[PDB]
Amino acid sequence: VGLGAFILGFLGAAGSTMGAASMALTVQARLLLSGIQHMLQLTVWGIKQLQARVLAVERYLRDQQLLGIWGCSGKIICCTNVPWNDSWSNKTINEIWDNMTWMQWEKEIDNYTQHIYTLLEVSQIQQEKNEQELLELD
Amino acid sequence: FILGFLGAAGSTMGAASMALTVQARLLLSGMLQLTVWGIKQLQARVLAVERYLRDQQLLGIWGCSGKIICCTNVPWNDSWSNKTINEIWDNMTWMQWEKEIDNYTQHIYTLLEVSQIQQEKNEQELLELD
Amino acid sequence: AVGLGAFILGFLGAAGSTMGAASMALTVQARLLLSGIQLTVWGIKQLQARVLAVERYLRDQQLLGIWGCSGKIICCTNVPWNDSWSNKTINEIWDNMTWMQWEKEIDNYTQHIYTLLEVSQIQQEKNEQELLELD
Amino acid sequence: AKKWVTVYYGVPVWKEATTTLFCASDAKAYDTEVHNVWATHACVPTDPNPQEIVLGNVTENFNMWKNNMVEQMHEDIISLWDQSLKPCVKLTPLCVTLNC
Amino acid sequence: TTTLFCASDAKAYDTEVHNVWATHACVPTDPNPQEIVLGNVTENFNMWKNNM
Amino acid sequence: KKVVLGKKGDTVELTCTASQKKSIQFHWKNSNQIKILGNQGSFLTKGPSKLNDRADSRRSLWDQGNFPLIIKNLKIEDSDTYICEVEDQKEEVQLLV
Amino acid sequence: NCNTSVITQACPKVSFEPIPIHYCAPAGFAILKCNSKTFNGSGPCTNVSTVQCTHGIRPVVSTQLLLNGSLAEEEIVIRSENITDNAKTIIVQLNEAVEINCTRPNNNTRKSIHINIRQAHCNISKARWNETLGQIVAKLEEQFPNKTIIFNHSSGGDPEIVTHSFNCGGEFFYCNTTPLFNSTWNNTRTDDYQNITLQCRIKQIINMWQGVGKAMYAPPIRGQIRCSSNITGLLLTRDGGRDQNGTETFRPGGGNMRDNWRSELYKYKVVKIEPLGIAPTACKRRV
Ligand SMILES: *[C@@H]1O[C@H](CO)[C@@H](O[C@@H]2O[C@H](CO)[C@@H](O[C@@H]3O[C@H](CO[C@H]4O[C@H](CO)[C@@H](O)[C@H](O)[C@@H]4O)[C@@H](O)[C@H](O[C@H]4O[C@H](CO)[C@@H](O)[C@H](O)[C@@H]4O[C@H]4O[C@H](CO)[C@@H](O)[C@H](O)[C@@H]4O[C@H]4O[C@H](CO)[C@@H](O)[C@H](O)[C@@H]4O)[C@@H]3O)[C@H](O)[C@H]2NC(C)=O)[C@H](O)[C@H]1NC(C)=O
Ligand SMILES: *[C@@H]1O[C@H](CO)[C@@H](O[C@@H]2O[C@H](CO)[C@@H](O[C@@H]3O[C@H](CO)[C@@H](O)[C@H](O[C@H]4O[C@H](CO)[C@@H](O)[C@H](O)[C@@H]4O)[C@@H]3O)[C@H](O)[C@H]2NC(C)=O)[C@H](O)[C@H]1NC(C)=O
Ligand SMILES: CCCCCCCCCCCCO[C@@H]1O[C@H](CO)[C@@H](O[C@H]2O[C@H](CO)[C@@H](O)[C@H](O)[C@H]2O)[C@H](O)[C@H]1O
Ligand SMILES: CCCCCCCCCCCCO[C@@H]1O[C@H](CO)[C@@H](O[C@H]2O[C@H](CO)[C@@H](O)[C@H](O)[C@H]2O)[C@H](O)[C@H]1O
Ligand SMILES: *[C@@H]1O[C@H](CO)[C@@H](O[C@@H]2O[C@H](CO)[C@@H](O)[C@H](O)[C@H]2NC(C)=O)[C@H](O)[C@H]1NC(C)=O
Ligand SMILES: *[C@@H]1O[C@H](CO)[C@@H](O[C@@H]2O[C@H](CO)[C@@H](O)[C@H](O)[C@H]2NC(C)=O)[C@H](O)[C@H]1NC(C)=O
Ligand SMILES: *[C@@H]1O[C@H](CO)[C@@H](O[C@@H]2O[C@H](CO)[C@@H](O)[C@H](O)[C@H]2NC(C)=O)[C@H](O)[C@H]1NC(C)=O
Ligand SMILES: *[C@@H]1O[C@H](CO)[C@@H](O[C@@H]2O[C@H](CO)[C@@H](O)[C@H](O)[C@H]2NC(C)=O)[C@H](O)[C@H]1NC(C)=O
Ligand SMILES: *[C@@H]1O[C@H](CO)[C@@H](O[C@@H]2O[C@H](CO)[C@@H](O)[C@H](O)[C@H]2NC(C)=O)[C@H](O)[C@H]1NC(C)=O
Ligand SMILES: *[C@@H]1O[C@H](CO)[C@@H](O[C@@H]2O[C@H](CO)[C@@H](O)[C@H](O)[C@H]2NC(C)=O)[C@H](O)[C@H]1NC(C)=O
Ligand SMILES: *[C@@H]1O[C@H](CO)[C@@H](O)[C@H](O)[C@H]1NC(C)=O
Ligand SMILES: *[C@@H]1O[C@H](CO)[C@@H](O)[C@H](O)[C@H]1NC(C)=O
Ligand SMILES: *[C@@H]1O[C@H](CO)[C@@H](O)[C@H](O)[C@H]1NC(C)=O
Ligand SMILES: *[C@@H]1O[C@H](CO)[C@@H](O)[C@H](O)[C@H]1NC(C)=O
Ligand SMILES: *[C@@H]1O[C@H](CO)[C@@H](O)[C@H](O)[C@H]1NC(C)=O
Ligand SMILES: *[C@@H]1O[C@H](CO)[C@@H](O)[C@H](O)[C@H]1NC(C)=O
Ligand SMILES: *[C@@H]1O[C@H](CO)[C@@H](O)[C@H](O)[C@H]1NC(C)=O
Ligand SMILES: *[C@@H]1O[C@H](CO)[C@@H](O)[C@H](O)[C@H]1NC(C)=O
Ligand SMILES: *[C@@H]1O[C@H](CO)[C@@H](O)[C@H](O)[C@H]1NC(C)=O
Ligand SMILES: *[C@@H]1O[C@H](CO)[C@@H](O)[C@H](O)[C@H]1NC(C)=O
Ligand SMILES: *[C@@H]1O[C@H](CO)[C@@H](O)[C@H](O)[C@H]1NC(C)=O
Ligand SMILES: *[C@@H]1O[C@H](CO)[C@@H](O)[C@H](O)[C@H]1NC(C)=O
Ligand SMILES: *[C@@H]1O[C@H](CO)[C@@H](O)[C@H](O)[C@H]1NC(C)=O
Ligand SMILES: *[C@@H]1O[C@H](CO)[C@@H](O)[C@H](O)[C@H]1NC(C)=O
Ligand SMILES: *[C@@H]1O[C@H](CO)[C@@H](O)[C@H](O)[C@H]1NC(C)=O
Ligand SMILES: *[C@@H]1O[C@H](CO)[C@@H](O)[C@H](O)[C@H]1NC(C)=O
């Protein structure tokens, strides 16, 4: 968790715009990779803190595999082949990436997410069929 | 924990796959004695995670690293099993199927390793040209 | 994970073994493993060590994506070796040197190498996306 | 350029929750006073080293009259209350399930 | 360059100051410590540069 | 509007209803927005109304979702339209004494 | 047909003194807190922080005044769901506490008058009370700038809300607050001039606050009853109407325990994380 106040949501700080968070993340990633009075109740709190950490890990791993349904297994950032509709959003790339935070962005398209998720599933199914059909020849 | 797919082979293999697809869609679409038991429960959860991560990387030896379902290029031998795809997937549960072929697995595991080695060898030789 | 390391991290092999020997031992264990062939105070301390190691592991597995090695333990790249960093041959180092000896030998080139790896990955992604401009 | 869908995991976004909170208090656990007695079995000790993170330039909409923490606190207190200050005589209405 | 935990078989109730300090300064010792002998590794130690 | 009738000196019951079948905070008001009755927690509160002495409610039915206004000893001048506020719906009844 | 269900229970007395209780989110959840010193009852906060646990709140049960709790950081803040709604509770949080000292004298031993052990009283410092109201009025005038502010006693209802009510050590007290709310205001005070003494009675048959019903408690403790509380707020109800020609009246409200807890929990919100998001980019997946 290079960025963020939460274990999950590790791609950035709340309040940062989406583009800014990405740039900050790249820098932090580079640095990390490059290597650049006991109280009795402490027992209780130690367990609770570990449970929070363990739970985040369990969820993380679960989601990393579930995303395979859209062809995004094991990824944090996953590019797809589904076109963006101006109907979902009439904003352009720079204005959303530079001026909107992730919460604002999700609010902007909140009631289209179920539609988009459906489309992603469909695309992955067709991609899989195409590969296997080619392998019936090869 | 993974505990397989949590169905205890109480359903056939085909049914389990369909159920997983459904759940993946739903999931993505959206007191002194407590110290002792809290620790034991927590230890078990940690252990499950460590084994999972290890095995996902160990499977790289067969070219299946990081996958839950891994399609290989090793052909099926009717001698291992003479059943068809539908017979196996629709009528058998996982604990019935593994029993049917329980002692052919060591042979299969060997074949999987061999196939992966040959595939890697071929790719690297091609890359000495390209 | 694999009882060659003697540490939670550093699992590819025991300290003191040559790099080559460690790889061979690791292959053997993979086959064996896949083939199937005050207590409260210390319990918490042990778990903290294990949880932390897992978190670092996962973190790094994703951070390595920056060089195109996400999700890998062993990863091959397209950055050529500079004889200037090291004048030794492949069997020379893999057969006779341990990991610590090797890392000490090329320690001051590490940041140079890391920089090159990032640059290569950027160029690779750029090239692929340009091809996909038409394809 | 052509705009394409990209999926991101690890996005710093949150929604309102409806969950169960834990209570904590510095119960004496030897005293006979009601709140200490209840807390002894109902609650955990407080956090010896609490932390607070100030968020960046964010705006969050709060609403004290739609706050479900209130209802939960209400239930905990009633349970506490009725395990202690027991009346000599308790009288409550009860009606027949008729449509009248 | 890190911070280590102290551990001791403190009694506390004895009132002796090391036991009283230890009561909160430290934790109980490991009831079942383990040691791993490493392979043929040579390591340079220096007691005069030891930050512990 | 619902219309309820009675004679001077009589007693009538005007009602509000919740679909909740639970005790809900509710209020009764006259046409001049003067509070008459309401539910505060489990208690009956009365407003600064001419009906403060006449107004009552069957507290035992509050958990049935029934929130009546009972007006005893009706005066001819009590013939107003009373307003219910339950949950977030409003109801109106005209009383003719 | 409704039939009262009656349960007879043992009647022990117990020591009874509220302890601060903190609430903590479970794993997977976090609590956001509003850090504005001027925060409203609802709406945006720009200073927001994340905590795992709330501050402690003592589980104090009272009906007209909030007797033990936190204070506002700078100013008296008046919070209401709808200030123009005659039916809503107005919660006034003070930035300073007013001490109230209640007692049951050991010499009050009379048991009956004719065919006092239930007699008690509470003191408020006059200068604290008048200062408190003057500040409240100044804030009420921000909402009602052209109207006279009248404080008054309750308009009627069950005694638990008509009088002030609290519990010390199992003793249920009912106190007359007419002396606190008989004041009328302009930008100036209309009262006289040290100690405002409230008359209190200790009762055995009380209404339930936790539900609808009645409850009877054992008779009073022989002596030495004392309470020492910090008033940190008021529960007021505004009396409006079509004929309120230049005057607004504020009477003690309350009786709804949810309002008492809201007066402390207004700064906290519980949230969950949804880490999966979507946005357009200019990349394409190779297929
Ligand atoms: C807002 O928060 C504040 C917090 O500060 C709340 O204020 C607190 O309210 C408490 C309510 O009871 C009150 O508690 C009382 O304190 C008395 C004084 O305690 C101190 O002195 C004693 C002296 O020995 C010390 O031991 C103690 O540690 C303190 O230093 C206590 O004496 C009271 O206990 C007695 O009454 C309770 C009532 O339920 C009984 O349960 C308890 O068993 C005690 O009963 C004795 O008295 C009765 C009288 O008839 C006897 O019948 C009985 O047998 C006991 O008598 C024996 O002891 C007396 C002692 O003199 C002796 O004379 C007799 O002969 C017997 O031996 C009780 O603990 C807090 O003090 C008070 N805090 C402050 C600062 O004032 C405030 O209420 C909150 N607001 C709201 C709305 O909740
Ligand atoms: C606190 O609130 C109370 C309640 O509102 C308020 O006291 C009320 O003042 C009004 C002032 O008009 C009183 O109303 C009248 O008082 C006279 C006194 O003798 C009565 O005679 C009147 O009754 C006649 O007129 C009525 C008009 O409809 C007839 O219905 C009736 O049959 C009579 O003909 C009338 O009551 C009102 O009674 C008081 N209420 C109480 C409980 O005293 C009080 O002043 C407020 N406090 C402050 C500080 O302002
Ligand atoms: C916090 C605990 C840490 C996580 C616990 C699990 C960590 C993993 C421990 C064992 C990992 C070993 O996983 C290792 O994978 C690499 C490839 O990906 C394989 O290494 C492979 O290199 C190439 C092919 O990749 C070939 O030479 C040969 O097939 C094999 O040696 C090893 O066969 C396998 O042993
Ligand atoms: C929940 C358990 C606790 C830990 C969870 C797992 C740790 C993950 C947290 C950090 C994740 C960031 O890991 C991220 O990986 C992706 C690829 O996969 C990389 O993706 C990278 O793509 C290219 C570089 O090629 C850049 O345009 C981009 O800025 C960069 O993000 C990021 O450089 C790296 O920062
Ligand atoms: C948000 O509110 C917090 C809480 O008051 C402010 O930070 C505090 O500043 C005081 C000043 O002495 C410190 O003592 C506290 O420890 C600080 N608290 C925390 C949690 O840091 C904070 O500055 C406010 N932020 C904004 C943007 O107004
Ligand atoms: C206190 O609550 C009121 C009621 O919601 C807030 O008033 C609203 O403020 C927003 C801010 O942009 C306006 O758009 C709304 O139109 C306002 N509503 C009304 C009815 O005017 C008020 O701002 C809140 N005060 C604070 C400090 O947040
Ligand atoms: C509450 O305040 C009253 C104010 O009168 C106190 O009663 C006075 O106490 C003094 C103490 O010397 C006596 O001289 C006065 O004569 C008393 N006045 C009356 C009218 O009796 C009362 O004791 C205080 N009570 C509490 C709980 O503090
Ligand atoms: C309620 O009792 C408290 C405690 O005795 C009074 O406050 C004390 O007043 C004396 C007077 O000199 C001060 O020395 C103490 O320091 C005060 N105590 C505290 C905690 O401040 C309080 O004034 C009484 N309140 C009323 C209304 O009589
Ligand atoms: C509070 O006390 C006042 C008196 O101090 C009570 O009001 C008095 O009630 C009698 C009853 O006939 C009237 O004659 C007096 O004129 C009233 N006095 C005042 C100042 O109004 C009052 O009812 C008590 N209130 C409660 C809730 O007990
Ligand atoms: C009422 O408020 C007073 C302060 O106005 C509280 O007394 C202070 O509590 C703090 C807590 O750390 C102490 O450090 C101060 O020394 C106390 N002041 C005095 C004069 O004693 C008091 O405890 C509050 N009472 C209640 C019931 O909450
Ligand atoms: C908040 O605005 C200031 C203005 O300069 C900026 O520096 C800071 O980084 C912003 N915080 C976030 C989270 O963007
Ligand atoms: C997205 O564009 C396609 C192009 O024809 C259109 O059919 C579809 O309805 C669009 N989606 C929305 C939500 O408008
Ligand atoms: C939507 O896109 C069209 C494209 O020309 C633009 O004209 C229109 O103003 C956009 N609407 C909004 C609300 O941005
Ligand atoms: C971001 O908002 C500022 C506000 O003035 C605007 O000027 C800027 O052009 C916006 N960025 C983009 C990419 O539209
Ligand atoms: C999303 O909700 C808003 C709320 O009014 C609505 O106007 C908008 O059309 C909704 N969008 C979709 C895709 O349903
Ligand atoms: C697979 O089938 C072929 C068919 O001739 C047979 O020769 C071979 O031995 C079989 N392999 C195994 C492992 O049984
Ligand atoms: C085994 O496979 C052969 C292949 O032709 C088939 O004829 C035979 O019936 C199969 N036996 C069983 C039991 O399925
Ligand atoms: C499953 O068993 C039943 C039993 O008669 C059989 O009819 C059915 O065809 C079997 N299904 C498959 C896929 O073999
Ligand atoms: C598996 O075990 C059974 C037990 O009798 C045996 O008959 C069968 O031939 C074994 N199969 C293999 C592949 O060894
Ligand atoms: C240590 O030396 C012995 C001598 O035979 C050798 O067998 C062993 O493998 C060595 N261990 C390492 C780690 O080199
Ligand atoms: C790596 O080899 C290239 C080949 O021209 C050389 O220019 C470069 O300086 C070498 N790197 C170092 C560190 O010498
Ligand atoms: C590097 O290897 C070559 C091979 O002949 C050797 O001549 C050269 O001296 C070596 N470099 C150094 C610094 O010894
Ligand atoms: C390893 O060291 C021995 C020592 O005699 C040497 O003979 C051998 O050639 C070395 N191996 C390599 C690969 O240099
Ligand atoms: C690497 O460190 C060694 C230690 O003395 C030094 O001799 C060598 O020249 C260093 N190499 C570089 C490139 O700085
Ligand atoms: C309040 O004070 C002003 C000061 O001139 C006065 O005019 C006004 O009449 C006063 N209010 C009432 C109700 O008398
Ligand atoms: C409140 O009481 C103080 C006591 O001296 C007095 O000076 C002040 O003027 C009073 N408040 C008002 C508004 O008169």
**DSSP calls for G43-72:** EEESSEEEESBPPPB-----SSEE-SS---
Task: Spell E4-39 as b/e; 16+ CB within 10 A means b.
Answer: eeebeebeeeeeeeebeebbeebbeeeeeeeeeeee
Contacts 24+ apart (CB under 8 A), C85-93: C85/C109, C85/C112, C85/C113, C91/C20, C93/C19
Q: How far apart are CA G259 and CA G89, in angstroms?
A: 8
Contact list, C98 vs chain E (CB under 8 Å): 41
Inspect the interface and report whether the beta carbons of G49 and D52 lie closer than 8 Å. Answer: yes
Torsion of CA E11, E16, E19, E25, to 10 degrees: 140
**Are residues G256 and F24 in contact, defined by beta-carbon separation less than 8 angstroms?**
no
Q: State if residue E39 touches ligand 20 by the CB under 6 angstroms criterion.
A: yes
What are the structure tokens assigned to A58, written together? 């369990």
Contact at CB, A76 and D10, closer than 8 angstroms: yes
How many Å apart are CA G253 and CA F40, to the nearest integer?
9
CB-based burial of residue F26 (10 Å sphere; 0-12 exposed, 13-18 middle, 19+ buried)? buried
Technique used? cryo-EM
Cα-Cα-Cα-Cα torsion G171, G174, G179, G181, nearest 10 degrees, comes to 120
Total structural domains in chain C? Answer: 1
| Nearest residue of chain C to residue A43 (CA atoms) | C41
Ligand in closest contact with the CA of G186: 25
Distance CA F23, CA D19 (A): 24
Task: Record the tokens describing residue C85, joined without a space.
Answer: 């960093």
Tokens coding C107: 């320690």
* Rounded CA separation G210/D79 (Å): 9
Contact yes or no for A74/B66 (Cβ under 8 A): yes
Q: Phi and psi dihedrals of G229, rounded to 5?
A: -120, 155
Q: How many CB atoms lie within 10 A of CB G133?
A: 21
Q: Which residues span the domain enclosing B87? A: 1-130
- Please give the sequence-ordered ranges of beta strands (E in DSSP) within F1-97, or none if there are none: 2-5, 12-17, 26-29, 35-40, 43-46, 55-56, 66-71, 81-86, 89-96
Phi, psi values for residue C16, rounded to 5°: 100, -15
State the Cα angle at G30 between G25 and G31, rounded to 5°: 85
For F33, which of G86, G155, G213 is closest by C-beta distance?
Answer: G86
Burial of G26 (0-12, 13-18, 19+ CB in 10 A): middle
| Residues A56, D9 contacting (CB under 8 angstroms) | no
Asked if F69 and F57 touch (Cβ cutoff 8 Å), the reply is yes
Give the nearest ligand 8 atom to G100 CA: 27
* One-character DSSP codes across chain E: --PPPPB----STT--HHHHHHHHH-BPPPSS------SS------GGG---
Residue D24 pairs in a beta bridge with D44, G22
Q: How far apart are the C-alpha atoms of G64 and D90, rounded to whole Å?
A: 24
Number of separate helices (H) and strands (E) present in chain B: 5, 0
CB contact under 8 A, A57 and B38: no
| CB neighbour class for B129 (10 Å; exposed up to 12, middle 13-18, buried from 19) | exposed
Residues lining ligand 3, Cβ inside 6 A: B 50, 53-54, 57-58, 60-61, 65, 120; C 1-2, 8, 11, 23, 26-27, 30, 53-54, 57, 72-74
Cβ distance D44 to G53 under 8 Å?
Answer: no
Ligand nearest to the CA of A114: 15
CA distance G72 to G92: 10
The residues pairing with G227 across neighbouring beta strands, listed in sequence order, are G102
Q: How many CA atoms lie within 13 A of E10 on its CB side?
A: 20
Q: Among the residues of G84-171, which ranges form H helices?
A: 126-140, 159-162
Q: In the block, which residue shows the tokens 């969050």? A: D60
* DSSP tag of G246: S
Residue C102: which of C81, C82, C86, C78 has the closest Cα? C86
- Phi/psi for D9 (5° steps) reads -115, 135
Let me know the angle formed at the C-alpha of A58 by A57 and A62, rounded to the nearest 5 degrees.
115
Query: Where do the DSSP E strands lie in D1-100?
Result: 4-9, 14-16, 22-24, 52-54, 60-63, 89-92
Compute the distance between CA of residue C103 and CA of residue F24 in angstroms, rounded to an integer. 73
Q: Which chains touch C (3 or more CB pairs under 8 A)?
A: A, B, E, G
Amino acid present at D40: T
Distance from CA of A111 to the nearest CA of C (A): 30
Resolution (A): 3.7
**Kind plus residue range of the DSSP H or E element containing G196:** strand G195-202
A77 Cβ neighbours under 8 A, 6+ residues apart: D6, D7, D8, D9
